[PDB]
Paper text:
The bromodomain and extra-terminal (BET) family of proteins, including BRD2, BRD3, BRD4, and BRDT, are chromatin reader proteins that bind via tandem bromodomains to acetylated lysines in histone N-terminal tails. BET proteins recruit co-activator complexes to chromatin to promote transcription of target genes. BRD4 regulates a number of genes essential for cell growth through the recruitment and maintenance of the pTEFb complex at gene promoters during mitosis. Chromatin readers bind to specific modifications on histone tails, translating the histone “code” into transcriptional effects by recruiting co-activator or co-repressor complexes to target genes.
Herein, we report the results of our studies using GSK1324726A (I-BET726), a novel, potent, and selective small molecule inhibitor of BET proteins. I-BET726 is a novel small molecule inhibitor that binds to the acetyl-lysine recognition pocket of BET family proteins. It binds with high affinity to BRD2 (IC50= 41 nM), BRD3 (IC50= 31 nM), and BRD4 (IC50= 22 nM), and competes with tetra-acetylated histone H4 peptides (K5ac, K8ac, K12ac, K16ac) for binding to the bromodomains of these proteins. I-BET726 is highly selective for BET family proteins, exhibiting no binding affinity for any bromodomain-containing homolog tested with the exception of CREBBP, for which I-BET726 binds with >1000-fold lower affinity than to BET family proteins. To determine if MYCN suppression is due to direct regulation of the MYCN locus by BET proteins, we analyzed recruitment of BRD4 to the MYCN promoter by chromatin immunoprecipitation (ChIP). BRD4 was specifically enriched at the MYCN promoter relative to IgG control ChIP in vehicle-treated samples, but not at an intergenic region on chromosome 12. Treatment with I-BET726 diminished BRD4 binding at the MYCN promoter in both non-amplified and MYCN-amplified cell lines, indicating that direct regulation by I-BET726 remains intact upon gene amplification. Taken together, these data demonstrate that I-BET726 directly modulates MYCN transcription by inhibiting BRD4 recruitment, and represses MYCN expression to a high degree regardless of amplification status. BCL2 down-regulation was previously observed with the BET inhibitor I-BET151, which displaced BET proteins from the BCL2 transcriptional start site in MLL-fusion leukemia cell lines. Consistent with these observations, we detected BRD4 enrichment at the BCL2 promoter in the SK–N–SH cell line, and treatment with I-BET726 abrogated this interaction. Here we show that a novel BET inhibitor, I-BET726, exhibits potent anti-proliferative activity in models of neuroblastoma, a solid tumor associated with a high frequency of MYCN gene amplifications.
Numbering used by the authors: 42 to 168
Write the structure that this text describes.
């Protein structure tokens, strides 16, 4: 089977900006999660060819990963923090939906999600 193309990371038809909250999401939140020992499976799109999981993209039609989120932040793709936070949650939700409750990857996602929530709890005021 084949992989789908990755989620778009820059769209010339879609308005772009930077906010101090989106800066915090890249510089503090994503940066902290990216170098966690459990981050690596989430640093790029799920590769259903490499993993030989032809049902992954039958079940998950809105994939998301931290590599995509990082690129989106780098490209000012998000207009606000809520769009970025939603993508992080889509990434976690996809993981919990596809994988079984006791799987290594689920425990890894749960650890990253706990840390994510700790970090976004101090999202700064908009300047
Ligand atoms: C995110 C998610 O739900 N899944 C996922 C995604 C990517 C990779 C993965 C990523 C990169 C490599 C690699 O660089 O070789 C290998 C596997 C693996 C997985 C998950 N598998 C897995 C991850 C970690 C450990 Cl310790 C054991 C099994 C399955 C799942 C589809």
């Amino acid at each position: 089977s084949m992989n789908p193309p990755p989620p778009e990371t820059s769209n010339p038809n879609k308005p772009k900006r930077q906010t101090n909250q989106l800066q915090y999401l890249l510089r503090v939140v994503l940066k902290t999660l990216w170098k966690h020992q459990f981050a690596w499976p989430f640093q790029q799109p799920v590769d259903a060819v490499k993993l030989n999981l032809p049902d992954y993209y039958k079940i998950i039609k809105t994939p998301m990963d931290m590599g995509t989120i990082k690129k989106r932040l780098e490209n000012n793709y998000y207009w606000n923090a809520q769009e970025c936070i939603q993508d992080f949650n889509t990434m976690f939700t996809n993981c919990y939906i596809y994988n079984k409750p006791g799987d290594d990857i689920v425990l890894m996602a749960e650890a990253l999600e706990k840390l994510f929530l700790q970090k976004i709890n101090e999202l700064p005021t908009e300047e």
